[PDB]
Nucleic acid binder design. Structure first.
Ligand SMILES: Nc1nc2c(ncn2[C@H]2C[C@H](O)[C@@H](COP(=O)(O)OP(=O)(O)OP(=O)(O)O)O2)c(=O)[nH]1
Ligand SMILES: [Ca+2]
Ligand SMILES: [Ca+2]
Ligand SMILES: [Ca+2]
Length: 341
DNA sequence: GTTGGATGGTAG
DNA sequence: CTAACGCTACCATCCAACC
């Protein structure tokens, strides 16, 4: 069938531009301030103006402020971005009811029965692009191909404010030419390990004997690269169900003291149980980011769903568990709920 | 020798 | 305080329980 992929352009940043258009065309940086000191924290994202000077997601707000001291630094308003996202995802639903909301900013439509060929798909893509640009002022990039992965790849090639169709014949061309690093699911750690095996594109995966591919990346990514490269890979647009909900916050200073940390842990619990919204988790994990940025987690699965009261007292037992079992001072603390009924 | 649970890594 | 927030899917690993 034919998959159409939407990825909203510089999302949090753009939304801020829609809310304050006197920002458009000059560098905008959306940050998560951590409160540890003046301008501590990270950059959630940045518009392309900012992005031209290396201000991207994940870098400290202070590294960015040295590069672009005069840029606009805006604190992250996820509540707001989520509202816009929700509305756009709802727009998308009126184009195909076979939707998979993949993330806050991306979604896959299976348009197979709304269009006859890729050319009709492209026009639909333009229809969708305008409709969003008209109803939400957000530019997005559309990637259309035979399936999820490739449609995502097309979007990655056209962004920002782009549209790429990757026809059955174009698919084949990329397998041989696309950098494996650009394959969805292939990050730096996997890229590195694949380059260690002479694997640069997809192609060289069909070259390498399966046996030593899983013997570097595990069974899953191995199957994944191959089905992609053999032009099989069908994965259907399945309606997303949220499997875990969590919240994790940053402390004013690293601490090992149970009492200093609790208020942070509870803040997260409260936030999490709120985001849960009618969902009853049977599992809770307290997650701690150490001083050296290792992420550790202690958790517990219950025979039956967890009440907020249970969450509270178990989280503490779990934080105790982390504190006794891990030497390091904790920097960030939070909780995550899974296994909903 | 699967399925579930706890914990950690990877990636987007 | 001294730079590194936030989220969630899926997978890997280990091991204990177990049909
Ligand atoms: N707090 C935080 N938010 C992030 C981070 N990475 C991404 N996000 C949020 C902000 C982004 O606007 C949003 C969508 O992620 P994308 O990967 O699609 O990047 P973005 O849309 O900003 O650029 P776009 O034109 O596709 O490239 O997700 C991160 O490291 N931290
Ligand atoms: Ca995206
Ligand atoms: Ca995006
Ligand atoms: Ca990559």
């Amino acid at each position: 069938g034919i998959v159409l992929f939407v990825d909203f352009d510089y999302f949090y940043a753009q939304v801020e531009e829609v809310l304050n258009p006197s920002l458009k065309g000059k560098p905008v940086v959306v940050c998560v301030f951590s409160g540890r000191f003046e301008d501590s924290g990270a950059v959630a994202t940045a518009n392309y103006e900012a992005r031209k000077f290396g201000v991207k997601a994940g870098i400290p707000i202070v590294e960015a402020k040295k590069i672009l001291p005069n840029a606009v630094y805006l604190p992250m308003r996820k509540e707001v971005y989520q509202q816009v996202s929700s509305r756009i995802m709802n727009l998308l639903r009126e184009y195909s009811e076979k939707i998979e909301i993949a993330s806050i900013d991306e979604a896959y439509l299976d348009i197979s029965d709304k269009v006859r060929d890729y050319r009709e798909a492209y026009n639909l893509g333009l229809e969708i692009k305008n409709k969003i640009l008209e109803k939400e002022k957000i530019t997005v990039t559309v990637g259309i191909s035979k399936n999820k992965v490739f449609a995502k790849i097309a979007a990655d090639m056209a962004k920002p404010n782009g549209i790429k169709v990757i026809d059955d014949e174009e698919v084949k061309r990329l397998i041989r030419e696309l950098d494996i690093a650009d394959v969805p699911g292939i990050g730096n750690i996997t890229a590195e390990k694949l380059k260690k095996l002479g694997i640069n594109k997809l192609v060289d995966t069909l070259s390498i004997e399966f046996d030593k591919l899983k013997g570097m990346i595990g069974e899953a990514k191995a199957k994944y690269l191959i089905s992609l490269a053999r032009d099989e890979y069908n994965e259907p647009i399945r309606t997303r169900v949220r499997k875990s909900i969590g919240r994790i916050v940053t402390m004013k200073r690293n601490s090992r003291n149970l009492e200093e940390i609790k208020p942070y842990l509870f803040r997260a619990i409260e936030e999490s149980y709120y985001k849960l919204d009618k969902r009853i988790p049977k599992a809770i994990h307290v997650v701690a980011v150490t001083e050296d940025l290792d992420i550790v987690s202690r958790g517990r699965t219950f025979p039956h769903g967890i009440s907020k009261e249970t969450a509270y007292s178990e989280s503490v037992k779990l934080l105790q568990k982390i504190l006794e079992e891990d030497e390091r001072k904790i920097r960030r603390i939070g909780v995550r709920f899974s296994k909903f009924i």
